[PDB]
Amino acid sequence: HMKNPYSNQIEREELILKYLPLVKAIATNIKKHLPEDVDIRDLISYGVIGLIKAVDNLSTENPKRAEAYIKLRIKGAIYDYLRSLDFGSRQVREKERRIKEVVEKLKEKLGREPTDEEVAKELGISTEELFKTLDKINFSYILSLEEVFRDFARDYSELIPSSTNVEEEVIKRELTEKVKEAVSKLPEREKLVIQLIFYEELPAKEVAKILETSVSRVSQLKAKALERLREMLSN
């Protein structure tokens, strides 16, 4: 049954409007892993562009499926923008090396784990500068891991629309089991940090308080865990 132009226009706007809270939720969740300096309005901005494009290229009539697709495009547009930034730059990777060295040097020299104030001191920077750097470093590993997950999504987002619910469940199970295999090969300490960060949805700063350690420590554990997962899932 044909549809009038005013109707198409309105259905579209209502659909966009309907999912704006979703863009907020996604931007906020991603913000927990980004340096404080990244403006959530930028994330939301790109996230809305992603939302509008998803709505236009929509034809699936299984609401839950439309939503899962919308969610996927929003995350995609936000990571598309974040990846165009300097996260994977050489300067960031260099700072990561310098920091690991400094941390290890202080560990032996003190017999214990250094504090963030002590790490920033041996580096000659403020703790705010350090927290930013650790966030950029950690986000680089998030980006790299996202590339892997996107490879999977790029494939299954082409099948699910013409697949049955039972088949979708199978495709989804193959993904969960593939991730479960990699997760099982993480050290207890790393796995615990990953759970508190992603399953409990807690920023590194909060995880530091729970584990009674420094932010620098929680960060190396997160980066190591994220690095492992990428290699594991890539092979």
Place this chain on the structure above:
Amino acid sequence: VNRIELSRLIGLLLETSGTNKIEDKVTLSKIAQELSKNDVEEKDLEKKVKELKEKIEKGEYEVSDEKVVKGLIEFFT
């Protein structure tokens, strides 16, 4: 505003002349400002931390591969 304004802002966006990229950057920013106007993010953050830490010290916190999987998948997909 938290409905009437959004609908109006979306209207400006979907109407693009007026020089797109430039105008849209502002419109998009305004849409973002409306969505995060009444932001007081931390609801039970402080309590969740305490409850979690107290449970980890009490040896009452389960770390499973299922939860970590649910975490990563929900975050990335």
